Amino acid sequence: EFVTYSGEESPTRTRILSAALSPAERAIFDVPIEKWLSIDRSSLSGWKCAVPRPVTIEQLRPVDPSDAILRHIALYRGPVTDLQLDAIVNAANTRCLGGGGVDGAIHRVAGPLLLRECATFNGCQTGECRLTKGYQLPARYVLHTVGPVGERPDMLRKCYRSILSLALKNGLRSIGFCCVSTGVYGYPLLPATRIALGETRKFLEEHGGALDMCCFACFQEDEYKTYEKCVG
């Protein structure tokens, strides 16, 4: 029933999947993906939230409560993993089996089952998004997206469209974003930020009533200040 990939359809994956799980971990892994949104995760003996004081939707402040669109956009100074929203975004690579930066961080907080779930599919194409459970994150789901290497605006735009499409299709009402393609993938920060906000605005204009909050988590001050300058 859930759509888990925006696109069209390994010794490393084999070995990830053959690693032992406890019975309690199996119970978590076994929850069907669509049930994870609403399940009482504390009913699973193997589960815990790895973020001591998650940031909830109520705690965020939108950019402009009076604006039709900007009342649904917030900026957050901190890591995306803090956010207790329906989904957070992971900036992945095409192998989609973890890495450095935010990808590494998300995997560390979520715990080992996130990698295990990523090993059940064959990576992620550039511009597309894979949906997984979020395990020990306060957020319910992770939207793993693969940005372009280099300044390819139509593929960075596609990433945002893919993320937002999956949220719409699956009834997810709040999304925490990280910077996609900036830094190691070399997408210049200001142009990337213009695209992130532009695509999110366009989506909110077209699908008003489907999303309650798009929060841009800015782990670095330069990211935060760039988002701030682009929203006024």
Residue numbers in the entry: 13 to 21, 39 to 261
Please quote the authors directly:
We named these proteins as Trypanosoma brucei MacroD-like protein (TbMDO) and Trypanosoma cruzi MacroD-like protein (TcMDO). We show that the trypanosomatid MacroD1/MacroD2 homologues are hydrolyzing both protein-linked ADP-ribose and free O-acetyl-ADP-ribose. The macrodomain fold (starting from residues 99 and 92 in TbMDO and TcMDO, respectively) is well-conserved between the human MacroD proteins and consists of a central mostly parallel six-stranded β-sheet surrounded by five α-helices. Active site of the macrodomains is located at the C-terminal edge of the β-sheet and is lined by N-terminal ends of four α-helices.
Crystal structures of TbMDO were determined to 1.95 Å and 1.2 Å resolution (for crystal form 1 and 2, respectively) and crystal structure of TcMDO to 2.0 Å resolution. The two crystal forms of TbMDO are almost identical with RMSD of 0.4 Å. Structures of TbMDO and TcMDO comprise residues from 11–261 and 13–257, respectively and share a highly conserved structure (RMSD 0.84 Å). While the N-terminus of the TbMDO folds back to the core and extends the β-sheet, the N-terminus of the TcMDO packs to the precisely same site but in the neighboring molecule in the crystal. When comparing the ADP-ribose bound structure to apo-TbMDO, it is evident that the binding site for ADP-ribose in TbMDO is preformed. Upon binding of ADP-ribose, eight water molecules (and a glycerol molecule) are displaced but no large conformational changes in coordinating residues are observed.
